[PDB]
Design a protein around this ligand. Structure first.
Ligand SMILES: CCCCCCCCCCCCCCCCCC(=O)OC[C@H](CO[C@@H]1O[C@H](CO[C@H]2O[C@H](CO)[C@H](O)[C@H](O)[C@H]2O)[C@H](O)[C@H](O)[C@H]1O)OC(=O)CCCCCCCCCCCCCCCCC
Ligand code: CLA
Ligand code: CLA
Ligand code: CLA
Ligand code: CLA
Ligand code: CLA
Ligand SMILES: C=Cc1c(C)c2cc3nc(c4c5[nH]c(cc6nc(cc1[nH]2)C(C)=C6CC)c(C)c5C(=O)[C@@H]4C(=O)OC)[C@@H](CCC(=O)OC/C=C(\C)CCC[C@H](C)CCC[C@H](C)CCCC(C)C)[C@@H]3C
Ligand SMILES: CCCCCCCCCCCCCCCC(=O)O[C@H](COC(=O)CCCCCCCCCCCC)CO[C@@H]1O[C@@H](CO)[C@H](O)[C@H](O)[C@@H]1O
Ligand SMILES: CC1=C(/C=C/C(C)=C/C=C/C(C)=C/C=C/C=C(C)/C=C/C=C(C)/C=C/C2=C(C)CCCC2(C)C)C(C)(C)CCC1
Ligand SMILES: CC1=C(/C=C/C(C)=C/C=C/C(C)=C/C=C/C=C(C)/C=C/C=C(C)/C=C/C2=C(C)CCCC2(C)C)C(C)(C)CCC1
Ligand SMILES: CC1=C(/C=C/C(C)=C/C=C/C(C)=C/C=C/C=C(C)/C=C/C=C(C)/C=C/C2=C(C)CCCC2(C)C)C(C)(C)CCC1
Ligand code: OEC
Ligand SMILES: [Ca+2]
Ligand SMILES: [Fe+2]
Lengths: 35, 82, 335, 447, 34, 37, 35, 340, 62
């Protein structure tokens, strides 16, 4: 089939995906903040 | 029933997908890592750095005590922090 | 005849007896009647019972100053501990009552019958040629009644501890348990809540959805219920129209469509979850308590920064301190 | 195998209910994970174990077992030589490769059915006899194992003895308790307070004698079975199904699982407490010991001292009259331990002794225990829930008893699950009610 | 192209790592008790 | 207390206990590759 | 008080007996059709 | 005229339905779950209360939260551009703006999601007993996170969006309101707790009453997602229970309505109760008991016992839990048992 | 002596690792189950010897 590349669902799946990873990276960074 | 639009099983399996994301994902991960790493996060969200809760003494908590003049109050609170 | 025993065994096993007395039921029946009858009397009339070890008798019965909400059957004494205190071990009923004899009689009996009640919940299924496992779903509550009435005491060393048979003393068991184990902060309870909270959530869903897709078979001026007939041939609602909506509420695959796969998720979620709380009480029975984050997040100089975990503990101390005011002689609560 | 032919993926291992060859590899491979563990973990313990720091203060649970058998301990459980530990740990870690090799092999290369590959090893579930045989062997295998203990005690080094006359220390038992009376007594002893059940056993003579009295019973059975078949009632009683066989053996374990959770939580003898922490009641006892001493050694007259309720802070009586320790501890007046007995008399804790026979070794041992009671959080933070951080510790006695109640329980659930399934797979309806012939539909209504 | 059973396990072991780095953070971290 | 010689294995010795968990996890990788027949 | 102990045991034994035998009485048998 | 062109677009059967309702449900919902996730890892509760409430501070999943605003704030909406924040986003974060932000957005988010259940239902043509059922949770959240506080002094006393930050809200209630003794909470429980029992006894009854419609054991497949005969036997079930509990269903239509009424009703009673605690109109004591215990010092019931626990919970907690009150309780005042 | 021993014990590690990935893939891959028959026999015998070697070498060290 000829499925589209950018759909409404893609807008959704990214609004939660992009922030998350951004956070998982930020949060993974704290593990080294000390004193 | 009615099954529409680009499927996930396929998309996850698509070589193009990882081509595209094996840049984006870690990009975000390192982008946020720096958000904390740089100490930017702190300043964005007025969150105290381990060395900024009480100035050497003041075993007293910096508690906002009134709306309206609330902000000016917080400012001076950081002030005292020397 | 044909030797009454042969016959007896057929009645006991009758598949068509109003109430299925079974082989398990041969115990469940007298055990539960001893418990239930002693409870009902104990709760109405019954002297104050020296619950803790001291001599500060607590009255739980109605005729002694209580109402349904405050009344209860008080736990056997602490001086008794884990020792077996039946009526014949008392010098007189009065002794038996003052020391809390009724409790032991009532719980050992309820736990015995409630177990056979679990066994009975299998026997009948077998006798009816149906699949088993119903009795395994009921092992959650039982496991919780076992934890709270038998396991917790075996750990702590006395039946004086271990939830008392009464509405308000049940709240007591809790408010104290917290202070002693910080349960709200234990994985097993949180799973207990996800189970009990979740269970309800889904009970509303299932009940909701189905009701929402009943097939029009009644006027506007007559119950929707009449649209169904006991034992009727086929289904009574559109399991596809149901999924047709729920699927679209969240998203197609984030939904059910297989009655069997849906109904199992209904009996597994709360059962698995409730099992855990039973395993929590049974676990915290040996003093592996909830999480402890008191004085974490310390700052740069060493000042303790306090997190919500501390306001918690602060309220827990208050409990720890006032509870059993006259029963302590030394610094640490190791019992 | 496949689903559209066997069972279902998440039910995989039942696809092997009839493929003994593989079902052997399953059993072998697994029986390797256990050894592997026993081994891999003992070294993990040892690698961290600190020669002179209480074992209980180091999260050990395997080494403690080896020590109790009398291996590298000496007086008071002094951890005299670590080697026996290293030794035991590795042997297992290797024997895991062996067993591991068998499993992987027997469940892949080897025949997936012992049918013709060897008629002696092949087996039939319903074969109400080849089972009684296999059982028999194993029943003998266990017996040899039990007797091994008696050996380690009566011949090779002895075992640990908290009750050691001189004081905790390895001791060679040479007077096993023979005689059914004493031995079997423990069998029908109430499990309730005071008279404990099997969990009593306060001396190694009995532990040893009791085991001697086992093979010479367990093997006696291992034979009787390789030489017979279930009688009449036996057959018209149980369900002879592979799954059903499992069930019975499932409940078995579960039942013991509790008997164990109780043992490690109450017994002082076969769990030294010098290697494990102090019993729960033990610690609640020692806090009184600690303060009956501190206050006496300060002017107080403990015998007459009267507390807030009128019971006497330090000493009060039990329901049967014995003089015990006061406070909530009135519930643990059943605790018996080395450090305390010398203060006991014929009517209970004697005053004269207490008043002037309390050696320092007790005052500090009593202190050690009250500060190492079985209390802590999940994240291992020793003490009451309201305690502050530092001193992370959780008694082995807790960890053990806790884990096993979970296992023990779930297995009882497991028992029902299978005993209930195999008991209906037999009558044959474990897949649904027969539309065409619903038993219910042919039964007189009750109304 | 890329198999499911290989996209999974990779990601799976992946999250086991980040969630493990988190579990390490419990000790040593700021949320440590030292 | 790991005899000196072997003390070059500390790091390894430290990880061995977890291996067993892995098996259950590998058994899931297997079925995933076999498409959960 | 002793008499009460006797009674109870007699009573408890009666039922414990019935239970054990009742199952020994070939329970598997009781069901629609034991395949 | 284009309204329709739009309506058409919105009501298109996509992966994730949208709808007019979605023009509200998503803008908010996300925006709320988003703020939580933010505040949970980045913003602090130091100027508001006096604790670390996020990850960046050292808190873990259990101990983190988006803690309510200072008491001195009042019932102020805390609009980023309002008298307080004065537009400054960061300070907004410090005074506790993130709380009213989550509260209010989540609020309209539950309004949105219900309209959805009502929009999708109208379309797909089914009865709306799922938007009706969902009123139960609106009640809970609308009374516990909105009404309650509006009845007290400020927002500072509302739950705080945190795991422990809630367990605290629990104990506080037990300690100051003596909630567990409230008939309305009791019903609340009786419903959540029994709604769980229904949701598990029914699930098990169905699964162990299934007819055989397959050959294997994994009977999940035996169910044709397509119509026809019931998959289990209601007749056999009704029989089981009736002989093993005396009572038993026998009207799938009633059974499933009960399953909607039980858990829904109980959370409603649960709500009414709290609407009461907003005015401190609690069910704290039984006077008949107090009068007796005042006069006779030997009268003790599990009732009185629990009341002392409360005295303790308040005495020791209050201080660090209500900073704006500058409480100072000398050790000699702290009520305590013996020894402990 | 330790050189010998360490490297000896270190051999028993890599060989074991190799066995582990092998034997399985071996038994599982009929594609030359005649070649591995040999190979495996090597690993097995060799492994055992290695163990026995390290056993004795341990004593010359500790
Ligand atoms: C859903 C389905 C429900 C599932 C939940 C099932 C729970 C099963 C409970 C485990 C029971 C196992 C029996 C046992 O190990 O029995 C033994 C245990 C422990 O016995 C203990 O025995 C003694 C402890 O040893 C003490 O006594 C001395 C021995 O002389 C030693 O010196 C030792 O050092 C000293 O500490 C004391 O008398 C204790 O108070 C206690 O009685 O029994 C007990 O607690 C149990 C007492 C209650 C009876 C239970 C009836 C079960 C049928
Ligand atoms: C004593 C050993 C034992 C043995 C040999 C068996 C053997 C069997 N079981 Mg039983 N079972 C047992 C104990 C045992 N069981 C117990 C104690 C329970 C209660 C929980 C069950 C519950 C049970 C159920 C519910 C079912 C079986 C089934 C089966 C059969 C198929 C096996 C299978 O489906 O594997 C596949 C296994 C898996 C899907 C993976 C294991 C998954 C568990 C839940 C994970 C636990 C892992 C670990 C402890 C937790 C991880 C850490 C956590 C903190 C994240 C097989 C005959 C099935 C059957 O067909 O019955 C005849 C079936 O449906 N069993
Ligand atoms: C650890 C315990 C365990 C064990 C011993 C077994 C054993 C077995 N399983 Mg079960 N299984 C388990 C857990 C276990 N399973 C769990 C948790 C699940 C749920 C996911 C299943 C699900 C399952 C299914 C769905 C099926 C089986 C089948 C089988 C049998 C055939 C094996 C096979 O097909 O391999 C396939 C071969 C491979 C792809 C190779 C796997 C790699 C090897 C075995 C490991 C090597 C180990 C180690 C790394 C090396 C040591 C080497 C050293 C000694 C030199 C075998 C008896 C099958 C069956 O019933 O057959 C009729 C089947 O269809 N199992
Ligand atoms: C749990 C116990 C156990 C049992 C009952 C069996 C049973 C069996 N094995 Mg296995 N085996 C085991 C453990 C076990 N094995 C382990 C741990 C390993 C790895 C070292 C092996 C490795 C193994 C191999 C390599 C072979 C067998 C074979 C056999 C079968 C016939 C050979 C024989 O019995 O010689 C009895 C020998 C003695 C007198 C000792 C028999 C069914 C053979 C086979 O599969 O043939 C079809 C075969 O070639 N086994
Ligand atoms: C000829 C007599 C015979 C003998 C002596 C044994 C002996 C043994 N069997 Mg085998 N078995 C036999 C026949 C025999 N079996 C037959 C005919 C079958 C049917 C194929 C099996 C099937 C079988 C299975 C399925 C298993 C065993 C296991 C075991 C071992 C005991 C478990 C253990 O760890 O104990 C502890 C040790 C002691 C008590 C100390 C001595 C033991 C070596 C188990 C195993 O592999 O464990 C290692 C196991 O899982 N056996
Ligand atoms: C490894 C364990 C083991 C196992 C699994 C078996 C299994 C079996 N034995 Mg063997 N046996 C063993 C060890 C074992 N035995 C030993 C060590 C000996 C001593 C040499 C014997 C001596 C022996 C004899 C003499 C006989 C058997 C028989 C049997 C078979 C059926 C009998 C039966 O189970 O009745 C189950 C029991 C009852 C119906 C009685 C219930 C009533 C009692 C009094 C109460 C039990 C209550 C308990 C104490 C409390 C806990 C209960 C719990 C639920 C809470 C069965 C295959 C019989 C057979 O068929 O011969 C081959 C037989 O006649 N066995
Ligand atoms: C125990 C907690 C509990 C939770 C977490 C919960 C959750 C949910 N229930 C839903 C539905 C339902 N629940 C129902 C009955 C019940 N639900 C109950 C209890 C709960 N229900 C109970 C007791 C009942 C009575 C039986 C019904 C009848 C339905 C549905 O029809 C519906 C569903 O579809 O079923 C699956 C889903 C609605 C999604 C949504 O509204 O998006 C819109 C809103 C969003 C995304 C914003 C969140 C809004 C809130 C106010 C903000 C919270 C703030 C943070 C995001 C999170 C807090 C953090 C914590 C640490 C405290 C959602 C998953
Ligand atoms: C199939 C398996 C089923 C299993 C079910 C189990 C469910 C239970 C939930 C457990 C959550 C894991 C928490 C680990 C604890 C930890 O440590 O993670 C924290 C972040 O957590 C987190 O960020 C977890 C928060 C989850 C967010 C919810 C996702 C919402 C969806 C958004 C759209 C996409 C951060 O750790 C911290 O890291 C440092 C911060 O300075 C410090 O060391 C702290 O003390 C602390 O350790
Ligand atoms: C069938 C099957 C299965 C299973 C499996 C199993 C169960 C396995 C096992 C395995 C095993 C069970 C293995 C083992 C191995 C071992 C080894 C390989 C070892 C080695 C050792 C060594 C080497 C030693 C030495 C040393 C020392 C002395 C010191 C120093 C250090 C060291 C460690 C080096 C699965 C699920 C996957 C899937 C399906 C099928
Ligand atoms: C090294 C060594 C040794 C040995 C070893 C062994 C024996 C091993 C084994 C191992 C193993 C045995 C491993 C394993 C691993 C695994 C893994 C890593 C897994 C993973 C998984 C995952 C990640 C999954 C996922 C998923 C999901 C999430 C979803 C659904 C689907 C799936 C399932 C896909 C010795 C001792 C000699 C010494 C030296 C060293
Ligand atoms: C606030 C705000 C805003 C916005 C924002 C947003 C919208 C955000 C978002 C965000 C997000 C959206 C985030 C996220 C994050 C996430 C995370 C961080 C996650 C994590 C996770 C995890 C860690 C997991 C894990 C697990 C579990 C739970 C279970 C199972 C298993 C596992 C292990 C996998 C604005 C500008 C308007 C304004 C101002 C305010
Ligand atoms: Mn009822 Ca458990 Mn707080 Mn010591 Mn008493
Ligand atoms: Ca190390
Ligand atoms: Fe239903």
């Amino acid at each position: 089939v000829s499925y589209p590349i950018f759909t409404v669902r893609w807008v959704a799946v990214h609004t939660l995906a992009v922030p998350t990873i951004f956070f998982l990276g930020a949060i993974a960074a704290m593990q080294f903040i000390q004193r | 029933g009615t099954t529409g639009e680009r499927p996930f099983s396929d998309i996850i399996t698509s070589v193009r997908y990882w081509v595209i994301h094996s840049i984006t994902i870690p990009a975000l991960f390192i982008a946020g890592w720096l958000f904390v790493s740089t100490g930017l996060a702190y300043d964005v969200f007025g969150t105290p750095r381990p060395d900024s809760y009480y100035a050497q003494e003041q075993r007293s908590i910096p508690l906002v005590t009134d709306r309206f003049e609330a902000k000016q109050q917080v400012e001076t609170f950081l002030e005292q922090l020397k | 005849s044909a030797n009454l025993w042969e016959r007896f065994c057929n009645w006991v096993t009758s598949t068509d007896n109003r109430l299925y007395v079974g082989w398990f039921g041969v115990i469940m029946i007298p055990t539960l009647l001893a418990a239930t009858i002693c409870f009902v009397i104990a709760f109405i009339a019954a002297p104050p019972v020296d619950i803790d070890g001291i001599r500060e008798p607590v009255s739980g019965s109605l005729l002694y100053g209580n109402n349904i909400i405050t009344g209860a059957v008080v736990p056997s004494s602490n001086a008794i501990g884990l020792h077996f205190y039946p009526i014949w071990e008392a010098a007189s009923l009065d002794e038996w009552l003052y020391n809390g004899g009724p409790y032991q009689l009532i719980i050992f009996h309820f736990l015995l019958g409630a177990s056979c009640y679990m066994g009975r919940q299998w026997e009948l299924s077998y006798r009816l040629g149906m699949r088993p496992w119903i009795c395994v779903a009921y092992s959650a509550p039982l496991a919780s009644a076992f934890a709270v009435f038998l396991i917790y005491p075996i750990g702590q060393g006395s039946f004086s501890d271990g939830m008392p048979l009464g509405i308000s003393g049940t709240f007591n068991f809790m408010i104290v348990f917290q202070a002693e184990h910080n349960i709200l902060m234990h994985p097993f309870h949180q799973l207990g809540v996800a189970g009990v909270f979740g269970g309800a959530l889904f009970c509303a869903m299932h009940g909701s959805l189905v009701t929402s897709s009943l097939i029009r078979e009644t006027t506007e001026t007559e119950s929707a219920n009449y649209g169904y007939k006991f034992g009727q041939e086929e289904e009574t609602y559109n399991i596809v129209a149901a999924h047709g909506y729920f699927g679209r509420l969240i998203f197609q695959y984030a939904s059910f469509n297989n009655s069997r796969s849906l109904h199992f998720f209904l009996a597994a979620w709360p059962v698995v979850g409730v099992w855990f709380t039973a395993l929590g009480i049974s676990t915290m029975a040996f003093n592996l308590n909830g999480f402890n984050f008191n004085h974490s997040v310390i700052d740069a100089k060493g000042n303790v920064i306090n997190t919500w975990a501390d306001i918690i503990n602060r309220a827990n101390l208050g409990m720890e301190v006032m509870h059993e005011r006259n029963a302590h002689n030394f610094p640490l609560d190791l019992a | 195998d496949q689903e559209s032919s066997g069972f279902a993926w998440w039910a995989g291992n039942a696809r092997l209910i009839n493929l003994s060859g593989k079902l052997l590899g399953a059993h072998v491979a697994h029986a390797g994970l256990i050894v592997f563990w026993a081994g891999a973990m003992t070294l993990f313990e040892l690698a961290h174990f600190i020669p002179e720091k209480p074992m209980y203060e180091q999260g050990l649970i395997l080494i403690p077992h080896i020590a109790t058998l009398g291996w590298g301990v000496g007086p008071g459980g002094e951890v005299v030589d670590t080697f026996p530990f290293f030794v035991v740990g590795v042997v297992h870690l290797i024997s895991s490769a062996v067993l591991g090799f068998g499993g992987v092999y027997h469940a892949i290369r080897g025949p997936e059915t012992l049918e013709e590959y060897s008629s002696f090893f092949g087996y039939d579930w319903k074969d109400k006899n080849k089972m009684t045989t296999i059982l028999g062997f194993h029943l003998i295998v266990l017996g040899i194992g039990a007797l091994l203990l008696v050996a380690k005690a009566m011949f090779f080094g002895g075992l640990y003895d908290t009750w050691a006359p001189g004081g905790g220390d390895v001791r060679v038992i040479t007077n096993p308790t023979l005689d059914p009376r004493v031995i079997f007594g423990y069998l029908l002893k109430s499990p309730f307070g005071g008279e404990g059940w099997i969990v009593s056993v306060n001396n190694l003579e009995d532990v040893v004698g009791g085991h001697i009295w086992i093979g010479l019973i367990c093997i006696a059975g291992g034979i009787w079975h390789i030489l017979t078949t279930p009688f009449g009632w036996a057959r018209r009683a149980f369900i002879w199904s592979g799954e059903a066989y499992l069930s019975y053996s499932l409940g078995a374990l579960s039942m013991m699982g509790f008997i164990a959770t109780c043992f490690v939580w109450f017994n002082n003898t076969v769990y030294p407490s010098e290697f494990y922490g102090p019993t729960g009641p033990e610690a609640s006892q020692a806090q009184a010991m600690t303060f009956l001493i501190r206050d006496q050694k300060l002017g107080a007259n403990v015998g007459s001292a009267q507390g807030p309720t009128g019971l006497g802070k330090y000493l009060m009586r039990s329901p049967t009259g014995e003089i015990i320790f006061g406070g909530e501890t009135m519930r643990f007046w059943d605790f018996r331990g080395p450090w305390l007995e010398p203060l006991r008399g014929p009517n209970g804790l004697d005053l004269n002794k207490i008043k002037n026979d309390i050696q320092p070794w007790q005052e500090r041992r009593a202190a050690e225990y009250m500060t190492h009671a079985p209390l802590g959080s999940l994240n291992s933070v020793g003490g009451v829930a309201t305690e502050i951080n530092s001193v992370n510790f959780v008694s082995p006695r807790s960890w053990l008893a806790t884990s096993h109640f979970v296992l023990a329980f779930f297995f009882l659930v497991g028992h029902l699950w299978h005993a209930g399934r195999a008991r209906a797979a037999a009558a044959g309806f474990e897949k649904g009610i027969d539309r065409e012939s619903e038993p219910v539909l042919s039964m007189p209504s009750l109304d | 192209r890329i198999p499911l059973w290989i996209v999974a396990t990779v990601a799976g072991m992946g999250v086991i790592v980040i969630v493990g780095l988190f579990f390490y953070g419990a000790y040593a971290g700021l949320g440590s008790s030292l | 207390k790991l005899p000196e010689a072997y003390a070059i294995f500390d790091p390894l010795v430290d990880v061995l206990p977890v291996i067993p968990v892995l098996f259950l996890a590998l058994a899931f990788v297997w079925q995933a590759a076999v498409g959960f027949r | 008080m002793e008499t009460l102990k006797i009674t109870v045991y007699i009573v408890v034994t009666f039922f414990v007996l019935l239970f054990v035998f009742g199952f020994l009485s070939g329970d598997p048998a009781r069901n629609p059709k034991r395949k | 005229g284009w309204f329709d062109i739009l309506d058409d677009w919105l009501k298109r059967d996509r992966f994730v339905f949208v709808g007019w309702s979605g023009i509200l449900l998503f803008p908010c919902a996300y925006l709320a779950l988003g703020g939580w996730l933010t505040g949970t890892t980045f913003v602090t509760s130091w100027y508001t209360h006096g604790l670390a409430s996020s990850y960046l501070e050292g808190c873990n999943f259990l101990t983190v939260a988006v803690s309510t605003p200072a008491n001195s704030m009042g019932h102020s909406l805390l609009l980023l551009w309002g008298p307080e924040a004065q537009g400054d986003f960061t300070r907004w974060c410090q005074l506790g703006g993130l709380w009213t932000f989550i509260a209010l957005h989540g609020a309209f988010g539950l309004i949105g999601f219900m309209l959805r259940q009502f929009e999708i239902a109208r379309l797909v043509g089914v009865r709306p007993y799922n938007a009706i059922a969902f009123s139960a949770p609106i009640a809970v959240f609308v009374s516990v996170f909105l009404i309650y506080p509006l009845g007290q002094s400020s927002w500072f006393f509302a739950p705080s969006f945190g795991v422990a930050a809630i367990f605290r809200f629990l104990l506080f209630f037990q300690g100051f309101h003596n909630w567990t003794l409230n008939p309305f909470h009791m019903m609340g429980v009786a419903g959540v707790l029994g709604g769980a029992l229904l949701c598990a006894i029914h699930g098990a009854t169905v699964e162990n009453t299934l007819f055989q419609d397959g050959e294997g054991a994994s009977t999940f497949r035996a169910f044709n997602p397509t119509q026809a005969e019931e998959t289990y036997s209601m007749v056999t079930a009704n029989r089981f229970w009736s002989q093993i509990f005396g009572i038993a269903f026998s009207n799938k239509r009633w059974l499933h309505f009960f399953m909607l009424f039980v858990p829904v009703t109980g959370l409603w009673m649960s709500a009414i109760g709290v609407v009461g605690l907003a005015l401190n109109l609690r069910s704290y004591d039984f006077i008949s008991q107090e009068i007796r215990a005042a006069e006779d010092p030997e009268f003790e019931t599990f009732y009185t016992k629990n009341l002392l626990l409360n005295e303790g919970i308040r005495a020791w907690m209050a201080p660090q839990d209500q900073p704006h009150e500058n409480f100072v309780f000398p050790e000699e005042v702290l009520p305590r048992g013996n020894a402990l | 002596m330790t050189i010998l021993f360490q490297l000896a014990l270190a051999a028993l590690v890599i060989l074991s690792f190799v066995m582990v990935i092998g034997v399985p893939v071996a038994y599982a891959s009929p594609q030359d189950w005649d070649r591995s028959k040999q190979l495996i026999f090597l690993g097995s015998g060799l492994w055992i010897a290695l163990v026995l070697v390290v056993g004795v070498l341990n004593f010359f060290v500790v």
